[PDB]
């Protein structure tokens, strides 16, 4: 993957290119108002060491922070997310993988329609990386999921169990 951060909107100002993850972008810039992704799938974070708000970005031009549903011009770390050849995950109604369950191997733009619940209280991510969105149609707070089990919402960094949509992390061409 290849990503370039710019201090100002419209690919203007001080800039930094990355090709692998970075635990701390603060050395290189103090604000980020536009991004160009050349290649790969990227999680951006509001804070250093992959904390605070998370933003999912893939190949394309982002002329301002709103384009990636940003909450501020703070961008202080980033992960390059691995492509996976297939995706598979289980959503549970209750913590610790109990209650009703739904299996997912494609993008789901409305959990509520398929599952009949507004919250996912535990997850088993078996294959691929995914982005969980607070809201349907890939809107609201975003949470990067990776292969592992999540016994409760705290394990993915959310404020609560509310979840509207799920996206497979797949590279854009």
Method: X-ray
Q: Where are the domains of the chain?
A: 1-83, 84-173
Distance CA 33, CA 74 (A): 9
Contact 137, 111 (CB under 8 A): no
Contact 70, 34 (CB under 8 A): no
**Using DSSP, how many helices (H) and how many strands (E) does the chain show?**
1, 14
Give me 104's structure tokens: 């997912």
The topology under which CATH files domain 84-173 is Gamma-B Crystallin; domain 1 (2.60.20)
At the second CATH level, the architecture of 1-83 is Sandwich (2.60)
Give me 146's structure tokens: 């990776």
The residues facing 62 across adjacent strands are 35
Do 1-83 and 84-173 share a fold?
Answer: yes
């Amino acid at each position: 993957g290849k990503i370039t951060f710019f201090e100002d909107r419209s690919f203007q100002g001080r800039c930094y290119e990355c090709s692998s993850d970075c635990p701390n972008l603060q050395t290189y810039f103090s604000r980020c108002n536009s991004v160009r992704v050349d290649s790969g799938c990227w999680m951006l974070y509001e804070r250093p060491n992959y904390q605070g708000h998370q933003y999912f970005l893939r190949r394309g031009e982002y002329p301002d922070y709103q384009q990636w549903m940003g909450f501020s011009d703070s961008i202080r770390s980033c992960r390059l997310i691995p492509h996976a050849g297939s995706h598979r995950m289980r959503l549970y109604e209750k913590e610790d993988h109990k209650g009703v369950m739904m299996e997912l191997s494609e993008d789901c733009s409305c959990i509520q329609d398929r599952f009949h619940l507004s919250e996912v209280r535990s997850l088993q991510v078996l294959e691929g990386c995914w982005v969980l969105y607070e809201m349907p149609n890939y809107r609201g707070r975003q949470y990067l999921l990776r292969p592992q089990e999540y016994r409760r919402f705290q394990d993915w960094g959310s404020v609560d169990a509310k979840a509207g949509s799920l996206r497979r992390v797949v590279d854009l061409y």
